[PDB]
């Protein structure tokens, strides 16, 4: 703060709001991470006593500690919210969030409005954590304390793939909201609705929707189009959102034994010696009997320590009655009923039942009624589908199989995987590689598409989800063969070409075949070698993919709006075109040079979408070379725009006024950001040349294989 | 900006203004660096064709570019301002901005109220630095533009010296006042005021100070109270303050041609299109005779590109009236002179004698009075004065003569350098360090005192401007001795027992000799093993230094006010202790994860001044064990403050109830804050006991050898 220290001050994002920043690009980097050098955590994982510590965790779930008390004598309850919460952020819109980077410990996401009280349970596991030392990251543990959960109550799991190392930073790339105020939604927002994307959350602080019912108003079949969207948004369909509601509050209770304003600061504003511990609780004792958390008191099921059917049977046996909670909230309670539900405490006393607006969409909701009924109908239907969805929801943002590690890893391939077979052939050699790019460049198509359809089917990936790339080949298949930014006729050329090259390469030939994959990415390198004059490294093993595997509303999210490296789009009214390309180079794990060799580079090489003059700035293009950046830096040449849009430039002849190139914000941006600036002058000086070459190479090779998990 | 994309949305700054952030650790990384892993600037700038640049720098003079023309056909006073500004941000209080790190290109300093048209000055220079590659940093190439600049117009420089590596982040460690409004004031004060420490400037987005006069009130006297100490926290006195405007303000002019409405928005807020060049202006033609910076129009002397006495002399010959410029601000014209000055445009026209309130401000002066008299009845003497200031005010933020590179380098010493001699003898060998490691435990001093004073030696050390350190052993000379953080009846029995020790040793030896430096750190690494079991590194070649060459003055500002490291001091009113520790964890260039290390450490070996036994999380204590880790995370503790201003804090049994240790904030940031916690617990683990251990020895020489800069 505006502490007269280091560290304090107005900085620039407090005087140019507007600005654009690269702080993206330097995020997890070794100097904040204190493993060793050469730590690898898929190895000490590999190494964990799984066994052993799954043991520990069960141990655990009995264990009432007397700071944080265990209602019913299980922890259980309390583990299944804090893993639903971890994974419960995941967005398919742009692949952010999840459970797989351990985000949770860290700021925001450890003082949501929805995370309180995981900070405690977050805290009982610390003794776990330090008997397994490294073996068992944050991440996964998190994870494997809600599957230890459900097994230790009689509910069998579909699986459990660990692997997701820890982070050491908040992770400041993930768009939560504008709003500046907590539960806020005034902005998410603008019945009959629209959530703008990227976001799949009502309000600013919580997981999914709000439980008193929309801007907290008891409307269930209202609270039940918020649900539909927003697990939509998480992947989710109707089944599967049933399935995980039901399922899940078919265990535990909530904590509102009072008024809120009861309730202290959050972890981050709370005073240091609770060390990392907020929400200091004055209602009573604070803890146990008295928690307050969220301010509804329901308990859902007669066994809330023990899998069972009552969530849904108990819904379809009573009529509700819209009521209030101890620290006044809006709920539902049951027309008429013996206490069967038992209290958390007392063992003798016992209550009515009741439930959540949310829970009660399930019924009022059209469809969902239906769902609700085909599993009272199947408990069974139900157990299988609800660890599928279970599984689902904690792995989603993992990625290919490949990165999956574990005892308990299922062998069944799943629909939402984007599976790609393993090699099952002799892979090329040095031989068949040199051969290969010659019988491409043979074939006569132009160099400048093969190196537009290796960018494209490579540029797909999207680092936070894992999704996307050269792998499997997809660019061939649905949606990504006609995406507009795909160039789908040139597309099909390069394709055609590679398809003969490969009958050709496979047929009656014995022993060794290649994929289209191989060859698409190959014919790029191909064509930049006899561009560059430089060897280009290429790694072979790729495989082919299926559409079977290839969920086409899945993909339909990484089609982008706007891709400054393909001169693709243009900008909206919250978003200028450079931001979408910082957006889009986080997503390819780019580095802020990295960033800038591949535009220089694309650009001389044409790469542009459609193929237009944007930013072609030399007079020899198809050859790489630097002028890109001496073109672009050049303080005899001047830009106006030609447009008011402001999406488009004209550069001309300060003193004769002659005009020499068209350019778009993709382009000048690396003239006007002095920080980017900086990397263009380093590549536009005159030794800069073949430093920049090599730079490009490796920045090609790098994207080319961002999704080679299998090596 | 919150916008629907990577990178928008509301930040964790946003929803906690007060909470302690680690950026000021992840910065300067090599991941934003374009350059090769095996690039050394120093190596590169050793083969560069430095008089070949000088003569094209020469060139650039007189080579008026017709977008942004040449005053009077030279550039020469544009680049000095250039010159002067870039170096012109230190300040001794931390030692951060100046030249040092080529931080004038990035925000926030590009865009300062005190740097229009510097933009346009550092883009003309560009042609330069792309012929010289990155054989010539920005850095430098800034600083020597102003020196190059001097000897053109007929002035002979003391000397100059390069090896500045270039930066390619915004620095954002840097406290430049809490003020929200450019040019704001209200803040940093609190005719007769106090400007705060660490601010070297009276106004945000100002160099040192107000040309108009204190809040542009054209009052002599006050603007010289305001010039006394900002030049003072910038390092200069009178004798060297009065030489340097009296240099600057002898070349050039001004420039206010009409009303500062006309000009438009500075570089990071200007139009994409513009490319990084700010400050439009719509007034007439925008530039050349109808230029904008500043708003005052005035120009000094009659020959504004030849070095002479102009100066002092007609400030000293004609006498001051206020008046105003064309934009409407305070300067000073002449009562009865004519026209003698000359246009920057019009060779036949001629205007009056015209100054500035900050240079009335010293010949009203009585102290700077007599000096600008002193200069004019001597003029070789002001030269010689000049020249040094001048040398001085660009190489202060540098460090020791072994950073500076270069054919310029002057062979004579300077008083403020700080300066060790080289070592001229032999020095010792492994056998000879294992001999005195045993010889200087053999004292009986126990292994605290070895430990504290070896460490208060290092701790000294600060990066902004690399001063301190461990070579020369400072701590025995004025002011650190008489130190309160450095216990001063402990350092003085640590001090006699390694003279002895070093007597002995010494001249009993042949041919070979030791440093009490050396013995200092040396001590701390025989103290270390024993107390670890472990090697410890030592690399000697350390000398000492003499009262003569260290600047005390200078020195007293490296006093802290908080040490978390040993103990010492308590927060401030917008200062918490904890964000002190991190701005010496900074300034001591060391990690997230050093810094926690380091703690540990420093705790278990009781290395507290004084001796209070706050954060000693061991019942082991001497020893080094990952005890301190263990013992503050452990969840079976809690804690409470016992002082009267919550500094110091209590743990105890959160079951029994009593009491166990005692404890600050600086030991309690480890449990409170989500990142520092999450590096603690890596220490904390049963696996982590023998990795704690390496990981202080790897940290506790990476900061005995900050200052080694003879390797
Ligand atoms: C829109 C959907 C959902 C909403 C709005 C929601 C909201 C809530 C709220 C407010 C609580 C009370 C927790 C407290 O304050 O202490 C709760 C409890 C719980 N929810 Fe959900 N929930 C949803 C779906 C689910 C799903 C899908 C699962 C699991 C897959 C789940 C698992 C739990 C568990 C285990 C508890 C018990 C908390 C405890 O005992 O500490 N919920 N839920
Ligand atoms: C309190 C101290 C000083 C203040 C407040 C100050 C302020 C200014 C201002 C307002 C201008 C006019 C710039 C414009 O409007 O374009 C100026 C010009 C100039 N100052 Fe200073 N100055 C100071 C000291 C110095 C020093 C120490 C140097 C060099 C050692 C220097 C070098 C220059 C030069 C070379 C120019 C002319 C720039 C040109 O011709 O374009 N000044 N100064
Ligand atoms: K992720
Ligand atoms: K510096």
Do not use: V
């Given at each position: 703060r505006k502490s007269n220290v280091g560290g304090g001050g107005t900085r620039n994002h407090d005087w140019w709001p507007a600005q654009l920043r690269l702080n993206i690009l330097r995020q997890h980097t070794p100097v904040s991470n204190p493993l060793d050098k050469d730590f690898d955590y898929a190895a000490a994982f590999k190494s964990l006593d799984y066994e052993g510590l799954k043991k520990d965790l069960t141990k655990l779930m009995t264990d009432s500690q007397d700071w944080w008390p265990a209602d019913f004598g299980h922890y259980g309850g309390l583990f299944i919210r804090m893993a639903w919460h971890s994974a419960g952020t995941y967005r398919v819109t742009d692949g952010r969030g999840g459970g797989?980077?351990?985000?949770?410990?860290?700021?925001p996401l450890n003082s949501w409005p929805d995370n309180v009280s995981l900070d405690k349970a977050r805290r009982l596991l610390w003794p776990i954590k330090q008997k397994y030392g490294?073996?068992?990251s944050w991440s996964d543990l998190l994870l494997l304390t809600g599957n230890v959960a459900l097994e230790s109550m009689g509910f069998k799991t579909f699986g459990f793939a660990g692997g997701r190392p820890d982070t050491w930073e908040a992770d400041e790339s993930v768009y939560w909201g504008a709003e500046t105020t907590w539960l806020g939604n005034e902005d998410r927002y603008s019945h009959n609705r629209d959530l703008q994307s990227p976001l799949a959350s009502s309000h600013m602080g919580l997981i999914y929707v709000n439980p008193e019912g929309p801007d907290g108003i008891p409307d269930p079949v209202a609270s039940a189009k918020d649900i539909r969207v927003t697990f939509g948004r998480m992947a989710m369909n109707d089944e599967e959102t049933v399935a995980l509601i039901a399922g899940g509050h078919s265990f535990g209770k909530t904590h509102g034994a009072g008024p809120t304003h009861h309730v202290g600061k959050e972890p981050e504003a709370a005073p240091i010696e609770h060390q990392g511990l907020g929400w200091a609780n004055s209602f009573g004792q604070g803890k146990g009997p008295d928690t307050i958390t969220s301010g509804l008191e329901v308990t859902w099921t007669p066994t809330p320590t023990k899998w069972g059917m009552g969530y849904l049977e108990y819904l379809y046996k009573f009529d509700w009655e819209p009521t209030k909670s101890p620290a006044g909230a809006n709920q539902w309670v049951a027309k008429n009923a013996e206490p069967t539900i038992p209290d958390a405490y007392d063992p003798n006393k016992k209550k009515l039942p009741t439930m959540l607006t949310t829970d009660i969409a399930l019924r009022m909701d059209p469809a969902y009624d239906k769902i609700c009924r085909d599993y009272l109908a199947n408990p069974d239907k139900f157990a299988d589908a609800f660890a599928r969805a279970w599984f689902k929801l904690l792995h989603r943002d993992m990625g290919p199989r490949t990165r999956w590690i574990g005892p308990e890893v299922p062998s069944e391939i799943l629909p939402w995987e984007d599976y790609i077979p393993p090699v099952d052939y002799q892979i090329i050699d040095d031989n068949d590689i040199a051969a290969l790019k010659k019988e491409i460049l043979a074939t006569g198509v132009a160099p400048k598409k093969l190196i537009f359809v290796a960018w494209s089917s490579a540029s797909s990936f999207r680092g936070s989800d894992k999704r996307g790339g050269a792998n499997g080949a997809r660019i061939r298949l649905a949606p990504q063969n006609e995406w507009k930014v795909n160039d789908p006729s040139t597309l099909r050329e390069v394709l055609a070409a590679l398809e003969s090259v490969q009958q050709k390469f496979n047929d009656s030939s014995s022993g060794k075949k290649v994929s289209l994959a191989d060859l698409i990415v190959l014919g790029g390198v191909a064509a930049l070698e006899q561009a560059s004059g430089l060897v280009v490294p290429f790694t072979p093993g790729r495989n082919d993919a299926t559409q079977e595997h290839t969920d086409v509303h899945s993909f339909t999210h990484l089609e982008p709006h706007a891709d400054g490296f393909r001169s693709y789009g243009k900008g909206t009214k919250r978003v200028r075109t450079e931001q979408f390309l910082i957006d889009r180079a986080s997503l390819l794990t780019l580095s802020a040079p990295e960033l800038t060799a591949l535009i220089g580079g694309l650009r001389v090489l044409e790469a542009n979408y459609d193929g237009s003059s944007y930013g072609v700035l030399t007079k020899t293009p198809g050859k790489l070379t630097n002028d890109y950046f001496v073109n672009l830096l050049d303080t005899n040449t001047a830009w106006k725009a030609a447009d008011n849009e402001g999406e488009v430039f004209i550069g001309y002849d300060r003193k004769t006024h002659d005009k020499k190139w068209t350019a778009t914000r993709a382009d000048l941006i690396f003239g006007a950001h002095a920080e980017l600036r900086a990397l263009a002058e380093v590549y536009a000086a005159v030794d800069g040349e073949e430093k920049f070459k090599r730079d490009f190479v490796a920045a090609w090779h790098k994207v080319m294989n961002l999704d080679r998990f299998d090596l």
């Open positions: 797989g980077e351990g985000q949770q410990r860290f700021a490294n073996k068992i």
